[PDB]
Design a protein around this ligand. Structure first.
Ligand SMILES: O=C(Nc1ccccc1)[C@H](C1CCCCC1)n1c(-c2ccc(Cl)cc2)nc2cc(F)c(F)cc21
Lengths: 11, 230
């Protein structure tokens, strides 16, 4: 899925 | 009129999280020390922007109630604010007091960094307008938090949940504007007006970066996620 690094940093 | 004990707690909390950013002195010392090529300045920019997004996610996560938001809305808020937050932090760095002549050289070095001519002028127009407001460190911290918690971002499913988190920050900022500048009752409105000027930078950011006078425009996988690049 798109924004996988952002989602990772957020979680 | 004055801040309540809860508002004082909120302000100090926001300030501590905000202060975990790379020091303005670090950035300006590097630019002022020696002139770099457009190739070297493009790479300095991408490294600065990658570190900034990383610290911004950490600051965002600490904003009261941010963790209670829908995960898709959390991503929408971060992606919608990252560029504006970078320009606001650049405006803060630009307006920090330096020895006589240093800010003139800093401006001249940024004008000749490789950035296209058409993007230079509105950037310094925004930086100098931010400077006239003579904002305190607390005002930049709260305004960054207000920028991140904007309920009017594209793709937000639950705007009211975002509104509820932004409202107490706007209330603290309003009280601070009346305390720091009691002679200027327009100060709070001026700050909010500066946020509308901030939004203009989103529309042309990708073009601004691709117009940089370099042969190849290499970005980090994280910058590709936050910016409309590669
Ligand atoms: O580092 C930077 N910005 C930054 C990023 C993230 C976090 C903090 C700052 C860059 C430099 C510019 C000169 C070449 C190297 C990068 N930068 C900018 C700027 C930001 C975005 C784009 Cl698209 C163009 C310029 N405006 C600045 C004002 C300052 F007082 C200044 F000191 C540095 C500034």
């Amino acid at each position: 899925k798109d924004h996988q690094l952002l989602r990772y940093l957020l979680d | 009129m004055e801040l309540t004990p809860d508002q004082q707690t909120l302000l100090h909390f926001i300030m501590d999280s905000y202060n975990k950013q790379r020091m303005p002195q670090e950035i300006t010392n590097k630019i002022l020390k020696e002139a770099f090529s457009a190739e070297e300045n493009f790479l300095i920019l991408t490294e600065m922007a990658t570190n900034h997004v990383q610290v911004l996610v950490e600051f965002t996560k600490k904003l009261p109630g941010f963790q209670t938001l829908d995960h898709e809305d959390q991503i929408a808020l971060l992606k919608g604010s990252a560029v504006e937050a970078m320009f606001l932090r650049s405006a803060e760095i630009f307006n920090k007091k330096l020895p006589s002549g240093h800010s003139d050289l800093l401006e001249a070095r940024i004008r000749n960094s490789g950035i296209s001519d058409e993007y230079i002028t509105p950037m310094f127009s925004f930086y100098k307008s931010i400077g006239e407001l003579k904002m305190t460190q607390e005002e930049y911290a709260l305004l960054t938090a207000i920028v991140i918690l904007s309920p009017d971002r594209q793709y937000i499913k639950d705007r009211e949940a975002v509104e509820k988190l932004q409202e107490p920050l706007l209330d603290v900022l309003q009280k601070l504007c009346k305390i720091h500048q009691p002679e200027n009752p327009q100060h709070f409105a001026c700050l909010l007006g500066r946020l509308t000027e901030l939004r203009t930078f989103n529309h042309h950011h990708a073009e601004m970066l691709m117009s940089w006078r370099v042969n190849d425009h290499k970005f980090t996988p994280l910058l590709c996620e936050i910016w409309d690049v590669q």
